[PDB]
UniProtKB/Swiss-Prot annotation, chains A, B, C:
Tissue-specific expression: Isoform 1 and isoform 6 are expressed at equal levels in resting peripheral blood mononuclear cells. After activation there is an increase in isoform 1 and decrease in the levels of isoform 6.
Residues represented out of the complete protein: 171 to 198 of 335
Classification of source organism: Eukaryota, Metazoa, Chordata, Craniata, Vertebrata
Subunit structure: Component of the death-induced signaling complex (DISC) composed of cell surface receptor FAS/CD95, adapter protein FADD and the CASP8 protease; recruitment of CASP8 to the complex is required for processing of CASP8 into the p18 and p10 subunits. Interacts directly (via DED domain) with NOL3 (via CARD domain); inhibits death-inducing signaling complex (DISC) assembly by inhibiting the increase in FAS-FADD binding induced by FAS activation. Binds DAXX. Interacts with HIPK3. Part of a complex containing HIPK3 and FADD. Binds RIPK1 and FAIM2. Interacts with BABAM2 and FEM1B.
Effect of residue 28 to I: In non-Hodgkin lymphoma; somatic mutation
Annotated disease: Autoimmune lymphoproliferative syndrome 1A: A disorder of apoptosis that manifests in early childhood and results in the accumulation of autoreactive lymphocytes. It is characterized by non-malignant lymphadenopathy with hepatosplenomegaly, and autoimmune hemolytic anemia, thrombocytopenia and neutropenia.
Membrane-spanning ranges: 4-20
Protein name as it appears in the record: Tumor necrosis factor receptor superfamily member 6
Domain of life: Eukaryota
Record note on modification: Palmitoylated. Palmitoylation by ZDHHC7 prevents the lysosomal degradation of FAS regulating its expression at the plasma membrane.
Entry comment, domain topic: Contains a death domain involved in the binding of FADD, and maybe to other cytosolic adapter proteins.
Function: Receptor for TNFSF6/FASLG. The adapter molecule FADD recruits caspase CASP8 to the activated receptor. The resulting death-inducing signaling complex (DISC) performs CASP8 proteolytic activation which initiates the subsequent cascade of caspases (aspartate-specific cysteine proteases) mediating apoptosis. FAS-mediated apoptosis may have a role in the induction of peripheral tolerance, in the antigen-stimulated suicide of mature T-cells, or both. The secreted isoforms 2 to 6 block apoptosis (in vitro).
Length: 28, 28, 28
C-alpha cells in the first residue's frame, strides 16, 4: 500500500549534495 | 492538479549530476 | 508527456550516487 506522498518525500534530499559542490571542492 | 505537479519538477534536476560521470573524459 | 507513475521512478535512482561518494574510490 505505497503512499503517493512518500514518493514526493524522496526527491527533496538528493538536491542537497549538488549545492555543496558549488561552494567548493577542496580549495580554490 | 497544481501542487502535485511541483513535486515532479524537483526530481529531474538532480539526475543531471549522475549523467556527467557517465560522459567521463575531460577537456574543460 | 509522461505518466504519473514515471515521475516517481526518477526520484529512486539519484540517492544511490551519494552513497558511492562516501566510499570514495581510488583514481577519479
Amino acid at each position: 500500500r505505497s503512499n503517493l506522498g512518500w514518493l514526493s518525500l524522496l526527491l527533496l534530499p538528493i538536491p542537497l549534495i549538488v549545492w555543496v559542490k558549488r561552494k567548493e571542492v577542496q580549495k580554490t
